[PDB]
Amino acid sequence: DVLMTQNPLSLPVSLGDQASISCRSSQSVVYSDGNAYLEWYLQKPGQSPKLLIYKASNRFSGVPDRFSASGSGTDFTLRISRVETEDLGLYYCFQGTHIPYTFGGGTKLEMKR
Amino acid sequence: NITDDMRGELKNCSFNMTTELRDKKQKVYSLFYRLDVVQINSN
Amino acid sequence: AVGIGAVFLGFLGAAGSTMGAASMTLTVQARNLLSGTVWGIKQLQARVLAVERYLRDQQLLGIWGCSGKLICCTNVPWNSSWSNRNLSEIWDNMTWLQWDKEISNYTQIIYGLLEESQNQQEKNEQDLLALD
Amino acid sequence: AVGIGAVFLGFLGAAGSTMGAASMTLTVQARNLLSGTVWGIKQLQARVLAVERYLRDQQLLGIWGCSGKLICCTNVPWNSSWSNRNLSEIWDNMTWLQWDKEISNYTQIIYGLLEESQNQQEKNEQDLLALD
Amino acid sequence: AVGIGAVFLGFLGAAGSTMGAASMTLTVQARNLLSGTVWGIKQLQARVLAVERYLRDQQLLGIWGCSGKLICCTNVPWNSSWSNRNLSEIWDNMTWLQWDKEISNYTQIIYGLLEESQNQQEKNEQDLLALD
Amino acid sequence: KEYRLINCNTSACTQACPKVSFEPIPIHYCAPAGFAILKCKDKKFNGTGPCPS
Amino acid sequence: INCTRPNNNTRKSIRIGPGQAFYATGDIIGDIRQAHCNVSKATWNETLGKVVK
Amino acid sequence: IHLENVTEEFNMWKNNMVEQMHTDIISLWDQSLKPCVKLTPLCVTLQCTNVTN
Numbered sequence: 143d144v145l146m147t148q149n150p151l152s153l154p155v156s157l158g159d160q161a162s163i164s165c166r167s168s169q170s171v172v173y174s175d176g177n178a179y180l181e182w183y184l185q186k187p188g189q190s191p192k193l194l195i196y197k198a199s200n201r202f203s204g205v206p207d208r209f210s211a212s213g214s215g216t217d218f219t220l221r222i223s224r225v226e227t228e229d230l231g232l233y234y235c236f237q238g239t240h241i242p243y244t245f246g247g248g249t250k251l252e253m254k255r
Numbered sequence: 256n257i258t259d260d261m262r263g264e265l266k267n268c269s270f271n272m273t274t275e276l277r278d279k280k281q282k283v284y285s286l287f288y289r290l291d292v293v294q295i296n297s298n
Numbered sequence: 299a300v301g302i303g304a305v306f307l308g309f310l311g312a313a314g315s316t317m318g319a320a321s322m323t324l325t326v327q328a329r330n331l332l333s334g335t336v337w338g339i340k341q342l343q344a345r346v347l348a349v350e351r352y353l354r355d356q357q358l359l360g361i362w363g364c365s366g367k368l369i370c371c372t373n374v375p376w377n378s379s380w381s382n383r384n385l386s387e388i389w390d391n392m393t394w395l396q397w398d399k400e401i402s403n404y405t406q407i408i409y410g411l412l413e414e415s416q417n418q419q420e421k422n423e424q425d426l427l428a429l430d
Numbered sequence: 431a432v433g434i435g436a437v438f439l440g441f442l443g444a445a446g447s448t449m450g451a452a453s454m455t456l457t458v459q460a461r462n463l464l465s466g467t468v469w470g471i472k473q474l475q476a477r478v479l480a481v482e483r484y485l486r487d488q489q490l491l492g493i494w495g496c497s498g499k500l501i502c503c504t505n506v507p508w509n510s511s512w513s514n515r516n517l518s519e520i521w522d523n524m525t526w527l528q529w530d531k532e533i534s535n536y537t538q539i540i541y542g543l544l545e546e547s548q549n550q551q552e553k554n555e556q557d558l559l560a561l562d
Numbered sequence: 563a564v565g566i567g568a569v570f571l572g573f574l575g576a577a578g579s580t581m582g583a584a585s586m587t588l589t590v591q592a593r594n595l596l597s598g599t600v601w602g603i604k605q606l607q608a609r610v611l612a613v614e615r616y617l618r619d620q621q622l623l624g625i626w627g628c629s630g631k632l633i634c635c636t637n638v639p640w641n642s643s644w645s646n647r648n649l650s651e652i653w654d655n656m657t658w659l660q661w662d663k664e665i666s667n668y669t670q671i672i673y674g675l676l677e678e679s680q681n682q683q684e685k686n687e688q689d690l691l692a693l694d
Numbered sequence: 695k696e697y698r699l700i701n702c703n704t705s706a707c708t709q710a711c712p713k714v715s716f717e718p719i720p721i722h723y724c725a726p727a728g729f730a731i732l733k734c735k736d737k738k739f740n741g742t743g744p745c746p747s
Numbered sequence: 748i749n750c751t752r753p754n755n756n757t758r759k760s761i762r763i764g765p766g767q768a769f770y771a772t773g774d775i776i777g778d779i780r781q782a783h784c785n786v787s788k789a790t791w792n793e794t795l796g797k798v799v800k
Numbered sequence: 801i802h803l804e805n806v807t808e809e810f811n812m813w814k815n816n817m818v819e820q821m822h823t824d825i826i827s828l829w830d831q832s833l834k835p836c837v838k839l840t841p842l843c844v845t846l847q848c849t850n851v852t853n
């Protein structure tokens with residue numbers, strides 16, 4: 143029911159630049175408790191998905207200050223500064239308040255040479 | 256300036272009506288749809 | 299994410315779960331029972347009727363010696379006639395709706411037995427208190 | 431035939447019986463207490479008043495430490511001033527109506543003594559719980 | 563003269579007294595809670611709402627295992643985070659209004675802990691009753 | 695010279711019953727169960743702020 | 748479905764009594780034409796085919 | 801009952817129990833007027849003249 147729209151499908155970026163990923167929810171994600179449980183997950187080629195940010199604002203565990211997320215309600219955005227080679231992979235946004243939960247469409251980060 | 260399909264659908268009716276004063280009456284007119292008025296039976 | 303457990307903790311969230319698991323969310327329904335011109339009259343009548351139903355249930359529980367408890371162990375032995383089903387079956391396979399359908403026939407018998415057991419226990423307490 | 435015992439088990443059926451025998455049909459009256467535009471307003475007012483009276487009685491019973499019980503033994507000794515009558519007389523000759531007429535004068539004194547006894551017992555429990 | 567103690571025994575008479583001393587007049591407020599066309603509708607709505615509030619409070623107390631008691635000792639240890647204040651300070655200097663202002667933040671946490679403790683105690687009772 | 699009552703273009707007036715008296719009588723407002731009325735006994739209270747008594 | 752009343756109606760207030768007004772219909776400004784509703788022929792045919800199915 | 805050592809915050813301007821009083825007084829006023837005579841016939845033409853008496 144909760145359609146998780148993620149744009150752009152591909153997000154080319156040069157090393158050391160800033161890449162912005164936008165992810166929009168069909169409806170409100172704020173739960174009755176007052177917190178919005180929207181998470182961003184990254185999948186490297188040949189590796190399982192890895193949590194990056196939880197609550198859409200809090201950092202998972204000492205993840206780089208480069209990885210910073212912001213937004214509210216319908217619109218949520220994840221920003222990655224000083225892009226590095228280890229950041230290559232598929233970025234997925236995910237909301238976790240309304241059952242069934244859904245994953246984002248997916249954004250493929252592409253580094254530039 | 257009615258159309259052929261609206262012939263007789265509207266009636267221009269004049270009647271006596273009570274005013275805000277109990278001893279006075281006013282002659283007024285209104286347009287009524289033919290479905291809202293029934294003839295009672297020249298005039 | 300909040301997690302699917304909050305759903306289990308919601309009103310009637312365990313209606314489909316096994317009665318053994320549903321026994322851990324009794325307080326949700328118990329609290330929902332007291333949640334809070336012609337239209338006003340009807341609303342007031344509904345509220346009064348809800349209060350009366352809750353009070354009748356509480357009076358019954360007290361009459362069985364189960365006042366203030368959501369789970370109350372009693373002295374009435376279980377008859378195999380009511381249900382020959384095992385314990386594991388009941389508390390790990392069925393749900394409370396299915397169980398209610400099964401034992402709906404004997405409910406009044408069980409209620410009367412509970413009342414008699416509580417009366418016997420009360421008078422035995424009073425008689426041991428006739429002895430101390 | 432149904433038998434005359436069902437009459438004894440009816441509402442107020444034991445009003446004429448000895449209070450000792452009437453003590454075995456308390457639940458009937460206890461349950462009857464909760465049995466269930468201007469006319470609707472009056473009916474609703476009556477129902478609300480009945481609920482309030484029942485709740486006041488239950489609150490009193492709880493304040494005496496007798497919550498959930500129809501027969502509750504207490505720590506207040508019986509004064510001969512209230513009634514010098516014997517036990518056999520009271521519980522095998524008189525009825526509850528006659529007894530109420532006799533002891534109607536001292537009822538408030540007994541209620542106050544019960545409240546004081548329950549308060550003393552509660553604070554003694556709390557003080558022994560100040561010691562354990 | 564009647565004496566100033568009757569004032570202490572009046573409704574809210576101990577609101578300014580130390581909570582330790584105010585703990586001896588709980589029954590006054592507890593009883594006041596149940597004291598007893600558009601105007602009639604509004605009065606009836608107020609009475610029904612009061613009854614509902616009282617019943618909700620009683621249901622909460624029962625859910626904590628404190629049914630029928632005005633003072634109920636529990637198994638939940640006191641957290642210093644809620645209040646690092648001493649016992650003498652609390653029960654001989656402050657009043658219930660001041661204390662409520664201080665601990666208003668942690669009230670829901672304490673309520674949840676009480677519910678969890680009562681559930682744990684109930685299931686431990688049922689499990690020891692799975693053993694006897 | 696013709697006149698009309700001032701209210702005739704707004705509504706019709708209801709004549710007060712001649713026996714009913716308009717004299718005010720004291721009315722006391724009382725608190726229901728679970729509620730209390732607090733009276734500020736300060737004799738220099740300006741209507742707002744803390745009331746020590 | 749698109750429904751319209753193409754007549755440019757005029758409202759007229761008539762004082763029936765004290766505070767009582769009757770809202771009559773005055774002259775219609777312009778031509779007088781029939782009210783009607785429009786639906787798409789193809790859409791209706793498709794929907795009827797589906798319900799028939 | 802005097803509440804010793806108790807300090808309370810009052811506000812006569814945001815106070816309730818004044819709106820309730822207003823509503824109750826208005827309702828009483830209307831209720832006392834329901835049974836009385838409605839002066840609909842009094843809305844009639846009057847031939848008035850000065851009282852030089």
Ligand SMILES: *[C@@H]1O[C@H](CO)[C@@H](O[C@@H]2O[C@H](CO)[C@@H](O[C@@H]3O[C@H](CO[C@H]4O[C@H](CO)[C@@H](O)[C@H](O)[C@@H]4O)[C@@H](O)[C@H](O[C@H]4O[C@H](CO)[C@@H](O)[C@H](O)[C@@H]4O)[C@@H]3O)[C@H](O)[C@H]2NC(C)=O)[C@H](O)[C@H]1NC(C)=O
Pocket residue numbers: 267268269284773774775
């Ligand atoms: C439903 O039926 C009612 C009938 O009750 C119609 O209302 C009448 O409509 C006619 C035509 O529109 C009106 O006649 C016109 O009245 C105008 C205003 O009247 C004043 O002026 C005249 C003198 O001209 C005075 O006698 C009168 O007392 C008023 O002071 C006039 O200005 C019009 O005159 C114009 O046309 C004539 C045509 O010959 C010219 O000679 C003039 O020079 C001038 O150009 C005209 O006389 C009539 O007054 C209306 N009566 C009422 C009571 O409203 C509704 O129109 C009709 N509605 C529908 C939808 O059919």
Ligand SMILES: *[C@@H]1O[C@H](CO)[C@@H](O[C@@H]2O[C@H](CO)[C@@H](O[C@@H]3O[C@H](CO)[C@@H](O)[C@H](O)[C@@H]3O)[C@H](O)[C@H]2NC(C)=O)[C@H](O)[C@H]1NC(C)=O
Pocket residue numbers: 269270271282
């Ligand atoms: C509204 O009220 C008026 C006033 O009463 C009505 O007008 C009156 O109508 C009657 C009958 O239609 C008239 O009587 C007739 O008069 C003619 C003309 O002299 C005469 O030839 C007939 O034989 C008959 O006597 C009356 O004169 C007339 N009065 C006035 C002042 O107009 C009117 O009919 C009522 N209805 C409407 C819709 O206006």
Ligand SMILES: *[C@@H]1O[C@H](CO)[C@@H](O[C@@H]2O[C@H](CO)[C@@H](O[C@@H]3O[C@H](CO)[C@@H](O)[C@H](O)[C@@H]3O)[C@H](O)[C@H]2NC(C)=O)[C@H](O)[C@H]1NC(C)=O
Pocket residue numbers: 749750751783784785
């Ligand atoms: C419902 O559908 C009918 C047609 O089936 C619509 O009638 C049409 O309405 C339009 C706009 O009102 C008319 O256009 C006019 O055309 C003339 C001649 O070209 C032009 O001179 C005018 O300036 C105006 O543009 C049209 O004539 C008329 N009839 C037809 C057969 O098209 C009607 O408007 C529709 N109504 C709704 C509510 O959808």
Ligand SMILES: *[C@@H]1O[C@H](CO)[C@@H](O[C@@H]2O[C@H](CO)[C@@H](O[C@@H]3O[C@H](CO)[C@@H](O)[C@H](O)[C@@H]3O)[C@H](O)[C@H]2NC(C)=O)[C@H](O)[C@H]1NC(C)=O
Pocket residue numbers: 748749785786787
């Ligand atoms: C009922 O009325 C609505 C208007 O509220 C009609 O919708 C409008 O229909 C017109 C067609 O006359 C549309 O204009 C056309 O738009 C297309 C692109 O979609 C363009 O290629 C055409 O050249 C023309 O400009 C208009 O966009 C459309 N608007 C909306 C909001 O729907 C509707 O067609 C009417 N239906 C019936 C059955 O009469």
Ligand SMILES: *[C@@H]1O[C@H](CO)[C@@H](O[C@@H]2O[C@H](CO)[C@@H](O)[C@H](O)[C@H]2NC(C)=O)[C@H](O)[C@H]1NC(C)=O
Pocket residue numbers: 700703704
């Ligand atoms: C009812 O009639 C009265 C009297 O005509 C109206 O009050 C007057 O309105 C005129 C406007 O044309 C003012 O110039 C006068 O000063 C008003 N008189 C007074 C005493 O204030 C009143 O407005 C009418 N009511 C309605 C609803 O039409």
Ligand SMILES: *[C@@H]1O[C@H](CO)[C@@H](O[C@@H]2O[C@H](CO)[C@@H](O)[C@H](O)[C@H]2NC(C)=O)[C@H](O)[C@H]1NC(C)=O
Pocket residue numbers: 755776
């Ligand atoms: C219906 O008729 C009225 C006539 O009163 C139109 O209102 C006039 O519209 C013109 C042009 O928009 C204005 O210049 C006038 O000032 C208006 N007069 C009034 C009294 O409002 C109205 O536009 C017509 N409606 C339609 C849909 O044509």
Ligand SMILES: *[C@@H]1O[C@H](CO)[C@@H](O[C@@H]2O[C@H](CO)[C@@H](O)[C@H](O)[C@H]2NC(C)=O)[C@H](O)[C@H]1NC(C)=O
Pocket residue numbers: 850
């Ligand atoms: C009767 O009273 C009327 C007023 O109701 C007098 O008429 C005039 O009223 C205006 C104000 O409305 C005054 O300024 C005038 O002084 C009044 N008099 C005149 C002559 O205009 C009227 O005079 C009074 N007397 C009679 C006999 O009608």
Ligand SMILES: *[C@@H]1O[C@H](CO)[C@@H](O)[C@H](O)[C@H]1NC(C)=O
Pocket residue numbers: 256777778
């Ligand atoms: C009525 O129709 C005629 C022509 O038939 C026209 O001259 C006249 O202006 C129309 N009236 C109105 C009010 O449009």
Ligand SMILES: *[C@@H]1O[C@H](CO)[C@@H](O)[C@H](O)[C@H]1NC(C)=O
Pocket residue numbers: 375376377378379
């Ligand atoms: C069980 O039910 C049977 C049949 O009604 C009855 O004879 C028996 O006494 C019952 N036993 C118990 C323990 O309820």
Ligand SMILES: *[C@@H]1O[C@H](CO)[C@@H](O)[C@H](O)[C@H]1NC(C)=O
Pocket residue numbers: 384
């Ligand atoms: C119930 O438990 C007994 C244990 O002796 C077992 O023999 C029996 O099969 C169980 N019931 C069912 C339906 O399997």
Ligand SMILES: *[C@@H]1O[C@H](CO)[C@@H](O)[C@H](O)[C@H]1NC(C)=O
Pocket residue numbers: 400401403
């Ligand atoms: C309960 O009784 C009804 C008849 O009143 C009977 O049809 C039904 O089978 C009974 N149910 C059980 C579980 O015995």
Ligand SMILES: *[C@@H]1O[C@H](CO)[C@@H](O)[C@H](O)[C@H]1NC(C)=O
Pocket residue numbers: 507508509510511
């Ligand atoms: C019994 O009543 C007498 C007279 O009121 C009183 O003096 C005495 O203390 C009472 N004793 C008990 C045990 O109530």
Ligand SMILES: *[C@@H]1O[C@H](CO)[C@@H](O)[C@H](O)[C@H]1NC(C)=O
Pocket residue numbers: 516
């Ligand atoms: C009460 O019992 C005593 C037992 O010693 C007896 O002497 C007395 O007569 C009894 N009361 C009456 C009224 O007989």
Ligand SMILES: *[C@@H]1O[C@H](CO)[C@@H](O)[C@H](O)[C@H]1NC(C)=O
Pocket residue numbers: 532533535
């Ligand atoms: C109870 O008190 C009344 C006076 O208030 C007195 O007439 C009556 O005799 C008393 N009853 C008993 C049993 O002492």
Ligand SMILES: *[C@@H]1O[C@H](CO)[C@@H](O)[C@H](O)[C@H]1NC(C)=O
Pocket residue numbers: 639640641642643
């Ligand atoms: C006391 O509160 C702290 C902080 O919330 C918590 O970590 C601790 O577990 C609590 N302990 C008890 C006994 O409630």
Ligand SMILES: *[C@@H]1O[C@H](CO)[C@@H](O)[C@H](O)[C@H]1NC(C)=O
Pocket residue numbers: 648
């Ligand atoms: C609380 O009691 C301890 C006892 O060791 C004492 O040291 C402390 O000063 C007391 N609290 C205050 C605020 O004095």
